[PDB]
Here is the input.
Amino acid sequence: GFPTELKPGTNQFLTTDDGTSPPILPGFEPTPLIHIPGEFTSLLDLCQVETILEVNNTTGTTGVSRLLIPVRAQNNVDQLCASFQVDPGRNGPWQSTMVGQICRYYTQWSGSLKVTFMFTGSFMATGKMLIAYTPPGSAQPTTREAAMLGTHIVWDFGLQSSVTLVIPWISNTHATGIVTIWYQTNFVVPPDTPTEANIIALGAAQKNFTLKLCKDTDE
Amino acid sequence: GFPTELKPGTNQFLTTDDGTSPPILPGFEPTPLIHIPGEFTSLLDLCQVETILEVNNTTGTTGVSRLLIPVRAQNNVDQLCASFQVDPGRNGPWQSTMVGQICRYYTQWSGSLKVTFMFTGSFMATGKMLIAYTPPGSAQPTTREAAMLGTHIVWDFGLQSSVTLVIPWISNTHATGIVTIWYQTNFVVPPDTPTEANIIALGAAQKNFTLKLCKDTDE
Amino acid sequence: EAAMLGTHIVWDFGLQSSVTLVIPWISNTHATGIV
Amino acid sequence: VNEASVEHFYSRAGLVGVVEVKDSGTSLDGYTVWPIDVMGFVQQRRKLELSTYMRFDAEFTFVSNLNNSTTPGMLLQYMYVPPGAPKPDSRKSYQWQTATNPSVFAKLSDPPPQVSVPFMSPATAYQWFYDGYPTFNLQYGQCPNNMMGHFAIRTVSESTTGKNIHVRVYMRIKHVRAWVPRPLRSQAYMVKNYPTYSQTITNTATDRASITTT
Amino acid sequence: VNEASVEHFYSRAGLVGVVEVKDSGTSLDGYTVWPIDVMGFVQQRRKLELSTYMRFDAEFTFVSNLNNSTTPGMLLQYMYVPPGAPKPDSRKSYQWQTATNPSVFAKLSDPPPQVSVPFMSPATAYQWFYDGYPTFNLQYGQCPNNMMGHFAIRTVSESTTGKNIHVRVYMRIKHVRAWVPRPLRSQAYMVKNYPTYSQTITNTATDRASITTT
Amino acid sequence: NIVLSYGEWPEYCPSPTRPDVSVNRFYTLSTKSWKTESTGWYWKFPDVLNDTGVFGQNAQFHYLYRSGFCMHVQCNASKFHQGALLVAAIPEFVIAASSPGLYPDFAHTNPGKDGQEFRDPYVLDAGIPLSQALIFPHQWINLRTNNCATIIMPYINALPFDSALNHSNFGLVVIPISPLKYCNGATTEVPITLTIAPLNSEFSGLR
Amino acid sequence: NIVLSYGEWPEYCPSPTRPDVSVNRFYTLSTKSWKTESTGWYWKFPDVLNDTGVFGQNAQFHYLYRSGFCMHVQCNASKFHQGALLVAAIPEFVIAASSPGLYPDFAHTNPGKDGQEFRDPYVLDAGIPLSQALIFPHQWINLRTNNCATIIMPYINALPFDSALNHSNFGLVVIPISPLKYCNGATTEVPITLTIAPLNSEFSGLR
Here is the structure.
């Protein structure tokens, strides 16, 4: 190895290179490493934590009200309640979610998402809501009956306070799914009880979620 | 190993580098190494040797008198005798100690110190002195009785010529302990005997002392 | 708040209709407890 | 997987400070000190404030040149003033010779000088958020144990040279370990070293027309 | 531990002498001899006089340049005059060719020349304090067995070049062994090679107001 | 049904006074009034007890301190009240001021045993968005389901021990997401009670 | 209770005349008068015997010399006297002059068998501070406890053998730290006696 030839590619400072460098302060023994609870070692583990979806993003609504899907009594049945696309990384409701913010630090993402809803009305208040999900091909169903023939869940918030909706797949390679919530039945309450509740939507990513090609963000 | 690439970091003269260099005088056999008694191989071993504390550093006191804590007879009891902080490396009494001088060659230090006192009066002279030590949190106790409820040693210099005070811990990371000496009792002597002695304080560092991040000094 | 630092019982009468309080000791030899 | 790992998320050495050794005109200094601050740019601060506690060692690299992008044979000294030592005050300072300040002598007409800096802190980890007060209103929430020492640069020269030298300091975070993930910043950064924000809160999401509009 | 060891305490090669090869103006010499003296600066002398007997070998490095910090292709010769040989007297000296004087030919436009020098002394160790007289008042306490030889530098050139060349000699003490620790100096250093001090003794510690004042 | 902050029961630092059940009792703080328009409240963890009882004594008289906590919120609403609270524990809760006067006042960085009402619940008074505060340990108080929430939070700090007064470890936050609405004729202010109990506490450096 | 300088008994250089107990006897030097204002005294080790007796002959007539020593100080004070001396042995004691005439006079570098009184006891006449002189082998003479102090010092020099007259190995220093105070009516000058006894001595190169 005594005679050597300088092949092309010398002196280049490659920023994304894993070279070695002399320590500037040899002998210096840094502070020993004691245990600290709460270490995270993968952003995906952060993505999988359910956070709130800013679903009510509408002109005028400010403050914490932007995280509430209102559910009111005099809503004639089979009328539409709320809708939002499933695109964690397009300017919309998902910006307020942890996964929505992390995916903006990467280029490509593919996996399966889950969306948990939570009813926050009086205990005495009963009713039924229909949550449908349209795959990215089609367009938004215009009437409750048309959505009824799809991947949907009937949700009797009188019996269950919270349900969960899994999204089969959402890939970003180059036209996205939509979720709609329909008033299945009316809003029934015994006397002397509020007639306006709120549904809270929580978004997350399942275990099969993945990212690729980190890049800078757009705030 | 014939083709090679000059990675970044060439030609740099790193002063604190452990490179190799050709001997300028090959073949030259230096003088053989005979044994010499008295080899030291760690500055900490030097730090652990008790040396005198310039405790009486006061304006006017010059010469060897600056190393003597006077102890006089007409000192009404429960009056305060002497006090000094425990900070080997701040401008004060500890500058005159070996450890006090070495720690100025380093940045960080943490460990446990010991301070030995020595009475140098007539043999016939009896009495009692109270040595208290206040941790770095609090402030100096103002009266003997208040110090009596602390880490203290009652010292009957009539019976013991020298006692030892261990300091639990003194760290330098970014408010330092203080040691006070109180006249517990009066100063009792039989007739025809001097009524003014001196207490000598010796400082040192225990075996658990450590240093870090050598740097230049401030004389 | 001053009583809260004593032998006390928090009593949520919404959940429990009746609780019981034991008094440790009360002697008559010659200045009595209070609830 | 292995692509969104926390190590890969902080790799890829990037620019942290563009310092300039002024030596011409109205600035006949010939030296400049740049205090190390990882949280220099916002794009980096927002990634770092994702976690609360962090432990790593950096690998600094200096990409220097004149202002016309030439690189003559001028000789430079880069000195790393460790945390707790005095920093120089002019071109000729006693501090330029203290053998406890590591220094790197490299000409301009050479590959960029590269030096690693170890984990330099009294604590167990750097702490971006410090809910507390040191010195047991302009002192709250400011931890002193994050200082990583300074970097002083001067041309080894006798008099002024009349040539401004721009320097670009690049840093690579190695061996990153992090704890206590936190919500990513939502508002603008109004002021360095403080999380203060503006009275006009901006919504995290963009507002559409109705809740039934896509 | 291992950080306050005696080896680490003397490591970290530092500047020991700034010599200048004058060749212009009123000094048309073109060469300069620098006698090796470890105890050059006070910050180094005080660290060395901590121990009485010391044994080591050095690794000298020469950081040379012109006065405008440029480094043209000028050719330099560094010659090490061993202890006991005659030193040159001008640019063209028979001494510049004595093959027993090791020499290093390196251009300016090259990395700094580096050479190790072995333990060169008749005794077992260098001795900073010599309570005695050689030649069995200006001769007391001066040991001759500490001389490490000279370093002569000249531009390999025919006539004068008209360019002053500043040289910075750096030294690294390797394989340090020391004996008989001594108290660190307390007074100013009045004169080189002698421990003389001033009539005005300065207290080792700073004086407070009273013995009961903190 | 108690959330374990980052899944680690609080433990004594292996080898300093280790107090006993005389100190490790349940301190029941005052009850705050959850009204309609109320925005929420927050407490700094070690600061909330620095002036109450034996724990306050130990904190205000020792030098180093480390302890876990078993914070416990409960709210006694009727079955006709509706609402939803979010209670989470935020390590290193650095409160920030809101410039249009550049740093928070001490009454806002260490509120005491009385808590402080949020000025900006959306942005948690710290710039970070509420919609993500769930990344911390939390529990939902939804009146139609549950009315209690217990968080066990161990000791999270860089150094082994720290001052109990200069640096507050974490902050307990409780915010109403779905506001409290109720028909006419009910107790117009649900009460919220916060019970704290130190765990595996330690001190060192008395007087 | 005898201090062993650096913990090495003096040993013969393994292979030069090796003298006997005729030379290895106890030379008792003169006694100096420790008064109140007295500052201290010092002796250069081999120089103190170069003119007394058979050892003086061997030193002044041979060429190479090496020997250990068992220096021994004792002071006979009464029980009503008070004071404290520091006696240490300093290898390579290089006396330095004190400029306001730049090098010490020979009477100060080799005082002889009579010793020299210190001019600057604080700085040991050598710039180094007395408060640190304890880094050398030493023993405390505190009148309330003990009145003797023995130091065994082996041969410390760079070369194996050296001249007994040109280069003095070490220097015995004895300084009063706590001055001598005594009430009226006592022997106003405590006597200090210094007994020396060479150990494992050697010479070579007679005449």
Q: What stands out?
A: DSSP finds two helices and 13 strands in chain F.
